[PDB]
Amino acid sequence: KQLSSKFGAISSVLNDILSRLDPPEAEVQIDRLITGRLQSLQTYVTQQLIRAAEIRASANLAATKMSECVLGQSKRVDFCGKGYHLMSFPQSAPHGVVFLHVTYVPAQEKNFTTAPAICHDGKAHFPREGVFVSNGTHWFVTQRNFYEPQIITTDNTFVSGNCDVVIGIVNNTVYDPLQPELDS
Amino acid sequence: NFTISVTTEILPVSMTKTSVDCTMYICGDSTECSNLLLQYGSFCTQLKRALTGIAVEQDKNTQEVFAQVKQIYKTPPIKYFGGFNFSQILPDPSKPSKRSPIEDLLFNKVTNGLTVLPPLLTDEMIAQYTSALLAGTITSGWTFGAGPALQIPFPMQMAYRFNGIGVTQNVLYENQKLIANQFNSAIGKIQDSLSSTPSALGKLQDVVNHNAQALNTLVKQLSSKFGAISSVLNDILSRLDPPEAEVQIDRLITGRLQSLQTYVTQQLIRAAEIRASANLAATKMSECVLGQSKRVDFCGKGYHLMSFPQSAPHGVVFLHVTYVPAQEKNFTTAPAICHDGKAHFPREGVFVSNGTHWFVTQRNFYEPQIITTDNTFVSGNCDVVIGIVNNTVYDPLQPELDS
Amino acid sequence: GVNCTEVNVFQTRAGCLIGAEYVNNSYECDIPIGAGICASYQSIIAYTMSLGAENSVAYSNNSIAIPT
Ligand SMILES: *[C@@H]1O[C@H](CO)[C@@H](O[C@@H]2O[C@H](CO)[C@@H](O)[C@H](O)[C@H]2NC(C)=O)[C@H](O)[C@H]1NC(C)=O
Ligand SMILES: *[C@@H]1O[C@H](CO)[C@@H](O[C@@H]2O[C@H](CO)[C@@H](O)[C@H](O)[C@H]2NC(C)=O)[C@H](O)[C@H]1NC(C)=O
Ligand SMILES: *[C@@H]1O[C@H](CO)[C@@H](O[C@@H]2O[C@H](CO)[C@@H](O)[C@H](O)[C@H]2NC(C)=O)[C@H](O)[C@H]1NC(C)=O
Ligand SMILES: *[C@@H]1O[C@H](CO)[C@@H](O[C@@H]2O[C@H](CO)[C@@H](O)[C@H](O)[C@H]2NC(C)=O)[C@H](O)[C@H]1NC(C)=O
Ligand SMILES: *[C@@H]1O[C@H](CO)[C@@H](O[C@@H]2O[C@H](CO)[C@@H](O)[C@H](O)[C@H]2NC(C)=O)[C@H](O)[C@H]1NC(C)=O
Ligand SMILES: *[C@@H]1O[C@H](CO)[C@@H](O)[C@H](O)[C@H]1NC(C)=O
Ligand SMILES: *[C@@H]1O[C@H](CO)[C@@H](O)[C@H](O)[C@H]1NC(C)=O
Ligand SMILES: *[C@@H]1O[C@H](CO)[C@@H](O)[C@H](O)[C@H]1NC(C)=O
Ligand SMILES: *[C@@H]1O[C@H](CO)[C@@H](O)[C@H](O)[C@H]1NC(C)=O
Ligand SMILES: *[C@@H]1O[C@H](CO)[C@@H](O)[C@H](O)[C@H]1NC(C)=O
Ligand SMILES: *[C@@H]1O[C@H](CO)[C@@H](O)[C@H](O)[C@H]1NC(C)=O
């Protein structure tokens, strides 16, 4: 569209404007038109350059996400999709990509009671990778998600000092493995 | 021994939106501009489209950097957080603007042909965003952005973070009051540093001064003669002949189009830089606030536990809580230990000894324990390693099953 | 930008809106305006930025929830 602009000249044409004007003013008119069109081309290439820089940054981010979310698994939060990330399925697209993220969305939580530690036999008990979760008079342990009760034993817990400094501690009875098999 | 310190990392988010139309900028209410500017084509229409696109993408970026949750969380009416005092962080309803004193001090410290477009999200909504995010990260633990919210007590989520960084959680319980006192002292010290030192907030002041200097240079540069007969727009409209006024004002609007073009290019490059900085800030938001990061030297100087999101004028301010070890002591190490001709390797840590007594320990803390069988594994013999030492390994229950 | 003593009429921070009636209700933003003002058609109305819904989970000394 900017090719057909007059740019302050008599006409936007090139061959017709040479015959109608004498060279001492046709040279000035042509020089003005050429400078205007070169300024328009400079604006176009500046816009193309900043757009190419933005697309290059986006493509670097897409290549990083190619290197991380698709190749293997990353444990970071809401970078590859929303929430926890399991895999990524890159699919073809003309001048772009489209993403399919298999995500982990926990739901349907239930209220429960906990404890910081267990004060049994004069010593404190701490979970290895779980947490003490209870609902009533009984006590159990479970993981971070998909609540599954388990009997507190000595292999999933460890000991560190006594139980006197932990605030909010509650007494509990812990079942020890190999206790029924002692005399046999 | 370990200490808890807090630092600041300030990244710009959004500048001031600008709107420029070509005709009113080049001249004031002249039909000659109307019949001459269209001879240059739609050059100024492209600039107006570019500025509107920059404003739209800036509003979208401002929406994206903060609004990363599907719900607004209000603070509980009980301030007990297991002995932890968070007073100047949570917003106080004794202020009409509902701001914490730290961002109040930050806002007090931080200082015609143009139009100043107000931002899409006002400062009240930004403060509400920061308050809701702080509530969500203080009462729902580090796992709330994946869907529906949960609730975890503050010592338990701190123990989860200490487990995730690579140390045992028991050292949190042995010095809980000491950790809370050190956290309160660090918060007070960084509040005093922000209220005293004026050079810690240089990035936001620099970008606002850059935008204001660009606007002021444009304003002062508009009123120049540019080699024409007259500088005032309507003076040459009544002093010069209207047939003879097709050269001076043409050169004037050509030079003004050049100045507007180079201002547009400078604003576009500055907007690209601010967009990159805000993408980095959004990465920080997604990595260090929504959950705990494991890569080193990304949030704070040292091992990162969790971070505090807060509101800043034309930007964001960060409170990164790190883990700085101290009290270095020399000790002797060994590659493995051999008992009864079989080599024993540590389960997760390393062997440590002061004299002639060997003990096991965790990764980055000293807690001596008796070398047992359950915390080690046997692979091969003690004849392939180099520089092994000799010590006995106790056996659990071995004197308990004799009955 | 301009004030609206000169020239149904509701005063806002980014100017004023002519031809619409302000409401005190809360809805989801459809047309972004500025300074927290949003407009939606259902004639045309204007309303402030309503940030979804408020849901504060209860907090106590001992309370834990695990999804199943
Ligand atoms: C807490 O949860 C446990 C686990 O389900 C409950 O124990 C069950 O109780 C029912 C009711 O008698 C029994 O039929 C099941 O066999 C029990 N299961 C196990 C694994 O013990 C317990 O009742 C719950 N407590 C409360 C107060 O709700
Ligand atoms: C680890 O460092 C902290 C910080 O200095 C020590 O806490 C100080 O302990 C002394 C004496 O025990 C007190 O007089 C100070 O008031 C404490 N500081 C604070 C801020 O409360 C702590 O004792 C050190 N622990 C070890 C094992 O050296
Ligand atoms: C948490 O810390 C703040 C600040 O250290 C405490 O606020 C102080 O409270 C006392 C008692 O009224 C005042 O004399 C001070 O002027 C307050 N300092 C301020 C406002 O900076 C607050 O009491 C602490 N809360 C708890 C529960 O310990
Ligand atoms: C290295 O530290 C350990 C841990 O305190 C010391 O072991 C103690 O030694 C005394 C004297 O034999 C015993 O009464 C204690 O029961 C030991 N404690 C433990 C936990 O084993 C050991 O003596 C220290 N070594 C040197 C050279 O000082
Ligand atoms: C650790 O124990 C092993 C086995 O008892 C030692 O190996 C033997 O050491 C004796 C004398 O120390 C030598 O006569 C044998 O020839 C060694 N046998 C082998 C297969 O090497 C070993 O020397 C001990 N190391 C230390 C530092 O006490
Ligand atoms: C747990 O109890 C709180 C307090 O009454 C309640 O608001 C919440 O909805 C409960 N959670 C569930 C899953 O019912
Ligand atoms: C039970 O707990 C209380 C306080 O938690 C403690 O004083 C008491 O000694 C405990 N009793 C037993 C048998 O553990
Ligand atoms: C450890 O040994 C080195 C080497 O002699 C010494 O420079 C350093 O001070 C020692 N550190 C401690 C804590 O003894
Ligand atoms: C507009 O004018 C009214 C009355 O003349 C005044 O109350 C109001 O503050 C003015 N608003 C602005 C933005 O100037
Ligand atoms: C409704 O909004 C108007 C602002 O136009 C305000 O003056 C009035 O007090 C509001 N009424 C209620 C009940 O909130
Ligand atoms: C937690 O326990 C303390 C005393 O240890 C008590 O003052 C406080 O009210 C309790 N908080 C609750 C029940 O929410």
PDB file of N, CA and C in Angstrom, chain A residues 89-125:
ATOM      1  N   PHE A  89       3.013 -34.068  25.039  1.00  0.00           N
ATOM      2  CA  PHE A  89       2.790 -34.628  23.706  1.00  0.00           C
ATOM      3  C   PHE A  89       2.885 -33.502  22.687  1.00  0.00           C
ATOM      4  N   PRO A  90       4.064 -33.263  22.117  1.00  0.00           N
ATOM      5  CA  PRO A  90       4.183 -32.225  21.086  1.00  0.00           C
ATOM      6  C   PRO A  90       3.593 -32.687  19.764  1.00  0.00           C
ATOM      7  N   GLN A  91       2.804 -31.812  19.147  1.00  0.00           N
ATOM      8  CA  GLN A  91       2.134 -32.121  17.895  1.00  0.00           C
ATOM      9  C   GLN A  91       2.472 -31.049  16.868  1.00  0.00           C
ATOM     10  N   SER A  92       2.442 -31.441  15.597  1.00  0.00           N
ATOM     11  CA  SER A  92       2.823 -30.539  14.519  1.00  0.00           C
ATOM     12  C   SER A  92       1.769 -29.458  14.307  1.00  0.00           C
ATOM     13  N   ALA A  93       2.235 -28.281  13.883  1.00  0.00           N
ATOM     14  CA  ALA A  93       1.383 -27.145  13.578  1.00  0.00           C
ATOM     15  C   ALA A  93       2.133 -26.244  12.609  1.00  0.00           C
ATOM     16  N   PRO A  94       1.442 -25.620  11.653  1.00  0.00           N
ATOM     17  CA  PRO A  94       2.124 -24.717  10.711  1.00  0.00           C
ATOM     18  C   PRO A  94       2.570 -23.438  11.407  1.00  0.00           C
ATOM     19  N   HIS A  95       3.893 -23.228  11.445  1.00  0.00           N
ATOM     20  CA  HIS A  95       4.528 -22.070  12.084  1.00  0.00           C
ATOM     21  C   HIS A  95       4.131 -21.943  13.555  1.00  0.00           C
ATOM     22  N   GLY A  96       4.103 -23.070  14.255  1.00  0.00           N
ATOM     23  CA  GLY A  96       3.750 -23.068  15.662  1.00  0.00           C
ATOM     24  C   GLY A  96       3.761 -24.478  16.206  1.00  0.00           C
ATOM     25  N   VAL A  97       3.426 -24.584  17.493  1.00  0.00           N
ATOM     26  CA  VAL A  97       3.276 -25.866  18.168  1.00  0.00           C
ATOM     27  C   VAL A  97       1.991 -25.841  18.985  1.00  0.00           C
ATOM     28  N   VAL A  98       1.475 -27.034  19.266  1.00  0.00           N
ATOM     29  CA  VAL A  98       0.316 -27.218  20.131  1.00  0.00           C
ATOM     30  C   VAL A  98       0.668 -28.282  21.165  1.00  0.00           C
ATOM     31  N   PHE A  99       0.269 -28.046  22.413  1.00  0.00           N
ATOM     32  CA  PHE A  99       0.740 -28.828  23.545  1.00  0.00           C
ATOM     33  C   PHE A  99      -0.404 -29.607  24.179  1.00  0.00           C
ATOM     34  N   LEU A 100      -0.098 -30.833  24.599  1.00  0.00           N
ATOM     35  CA  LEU A 100      -1.030 -31.686  25.333  1.00  0.00           C
ATOM     36  C   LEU A 100      -0.321 -32.172  26.589  1.00  0.00           C
ATOM     37  N   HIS A 101      -0.699 -31.623  27.740  1.00  0.00           N
ATOM     38  CA  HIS A 101      -0.053 -31.937  29.008  1.00  0.00           C
ATOM     39  C   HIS A 101      -0.948 -32.856  29.828  1.00  0.00           C
ATOM     40  N   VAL A 102      -0.444 -34.044  30.148  1.00  0.00           N
ATOM     41  CA  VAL A 102      -1.120 -34.939  31.080  1.00  0.00           C
ATOM     42  C   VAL A 102      -0.783 -34.467  32.491  1.00  0.00           C
ATOM     43  N   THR A 103      -1.788 -33.977  33.211  1.00  0.00           N
ATOM     44  CA  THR A 103      -1.586 -33.330  34.496  1.00  0.00           C
ATOM     45  C   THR A 103      -2.205 -34.149  35.622  1.00  0.00           C
ATOM     46  N   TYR A 104      -1.716 -33.896  36.832  1.00  0.00           N
ATOM     47  CA  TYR A 104      -2.200 -34.539  38.049  1.00  0.00           C
ATOM     48  C   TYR A 104      -2.975 -33.497  38.845  1.00  0.00           C
ATOM     49  N   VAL A 105      -4.288 -33.665  38.924  1.00  0.00           N
ATOM     50  CA  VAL A 105      -5.163 -32.748  39.641  1.00  0.00           C
ATOM     51  C   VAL A 105      -5.834 -33.515  40.774  1.00  0.00           C
ATOM     52  N   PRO A 106      -5.296 -33.437  41.989  1.00  0.00           N
ATOM     53  CA  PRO A 106      -5.971 -34.055  43.134  1.00  0.00           C
ATOM     54  C   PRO A 106      -7.251 -33.315  43.484  1.00  0.00           C
ATOM     55  N   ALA A 107      -8.222 -34.064  43.999  1.00  0.00           N
ATOM     56  CA  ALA A 107      -9.521 -33.504  44.352  1.00  0.00           C
ATOM     57  C   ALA A 107     -10.168 -34.402  45.400  1.00  0.00           C
ATOM     58  N   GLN A 108     -11.349 -33.977  45.864  1.00  0.00           N
ATOM     59  CA  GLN A 108     -12.179 -34.707  46.828  1.00  0.00           C
ATOM     60  C   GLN A 108     -11.418 -34.986  48.127  1.00  0.00           C
ATOM     61  N   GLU A 109     -10.912 -33.910  48.726  1.00  0.00           N
ATOM     62  CA  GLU A 109     -10.179 -34.027  49.975  1.00  0.00           C
ATOM     63  C   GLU A 109     -11.134 -34.288  51.137  1.00  0.00           C
ATOM     64  N   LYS A 110     -10.572 -34.798  52.232  1.00  0.00           N
ATOM     65  CA  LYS A 110     -11.329 -35.095  53.440  1.00  0.00           C
ATOM     66  C   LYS A 110     -10.589 -34.544  54.649  1.00  0.00           C
ATOM     67  N   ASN A 111     -11.348 -34.079  55.637  1.00  0.00           N
ATOM     68  CA  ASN A 111     -10.752 -33.526  56.845  1.00  0.00           C
ATOM     69  C   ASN A 111     -10.167 -34.635  57.712  1.00  0.00           C
ATOM     70  N   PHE A 112      -9.021 -34.350  58.327  1.00  0.00           N
ATOM     71  CA  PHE A 112      -8.319 -35.330  59.142  1.00  0.00           C
ATOM     72  C   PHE A 112      -7.540 -34.603  60.231  1.00  0.00           C
ATOM     73  N   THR A 113      -7.033 -35.379  61.184  1.00  0.00           N
ATOM     74  CA  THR A 113      -6.227 -34.865  62.280  1.00  0.00           C
ATOM     75  C   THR A 113      -4.809 -35.414  62.187  1.00  0.00           C
ATOM     76  N   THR A 114      -3.846 -34.615  62.644  1.00  0.00           N
ATOM     77  CA  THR A 114      -2.440 -34.990  62.542  1.00  0.00           C
ATOM     78  C   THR A 114      -1.720 -34.857  63.879  1.00  0.00           C
ATOM     79  N   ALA A 115      -0.394 -35.029  63.859  1.00  0.00           N
ATOM     80  CA  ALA A 115       0.445 -34.864  65.037  1.00  0.00           C
ATOM     81  C   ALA A 115       1.855 -34.551  64.574  1.00  0.00           C
ATOM     82  N   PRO A 116       2.591 -33.685  65.277  1.00  0.00           N
ATOM     83  CA  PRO A 116       3.975 -33.410  64.853  1.00  0.00           C
ATOM     84  C   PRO A 116       4.912 -34.585  65.065  1.00  0.00           C
ATOM     85  N   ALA A 117       4.765 -35.312  66.170  1.00  0.00           N
ATOM     86  CA  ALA A 117       5.625 -36.447  66.469  1.00  0.00           C
ATOM     87  C   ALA A 117       4.887 -37.379  67.419  1.00  0.00           C
ATOM     88  N   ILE A 118       5.514 -38.519  67.700  1.00  0.00           N
ATOM     89  CA  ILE A 118       4.963 -39.532  68.592  1.00  0.00           C
ATOM     90  C   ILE A 118       5.919 -39.693  69.764  1.00  0.00           C
ATOM     91  N   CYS A 119       5.400 -39.527  70.980  1.00  0.00           N
ATOM     92  CA  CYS A 119       6.190 -39.661  72.203  1.00  0.00           C
ATOM     93  C   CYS A 119       5.891 -41.033  72.798  1.00  0.00           C
ATOM     94  N   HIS A 120       6.679 -42.026  72.393  1.00  0.00           N
ATOM     95  CA  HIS A 120       6.503 -43.402  72.836  1.00  0.00           C
ATOM     96  C   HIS A 120       7.804 -43.901  73.446  1.00  0.00           C
ATOM     97  N   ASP A 121       7.695 -44.526  74.626  1.00  0.00           N
ATOM     98  CA  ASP A 121       8.826 -45.102  75.364  1.00  0.00           C
ATOM     99  C   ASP A 121       9.902 -44.060  75.671  1.00  0.00           C
ATOM    100  N   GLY A 122       9.474 -42.828  75.937  1.00  0.00           N
ATOM    101  CA  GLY A 122      10.391 -41.772  76.312  1.00  0.00           C
ATOM    102  C   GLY A 122      11.214 -41.190  75.186  1.00  0.00           C
ATOM    103  N   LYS A 123      10.912 -41.528  73.935  1.00  0.00           N
ATOM    104  CA  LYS A 123      11.659 -41.028  72.791  1.00  0.00           C
ATOM    105  C   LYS A 123      10.694 -40.544  71.718  1.00  0.00           C
ATOM    106  N   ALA A 124      11.174 -39.625  70.887  1.00  0.00           N
ATOM    107  CA  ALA A 124      10.370 -39.044  69.824  1.00  0.00           C
ATOM    108  C   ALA A 124      10.476 -39.875  68.552  1.00  0.00           C
ATOM    109  N   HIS A 125       9.371 -39.939  67.816  1.00  0.00           N
ATOM    110  CA  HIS A 125       9.293 -40.683  66.569  1.00  0.00           C
ATOM    111  C   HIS A 125       8.939 -39.737  65.430  1.00  0.00           C
TER     112      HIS A 125
END
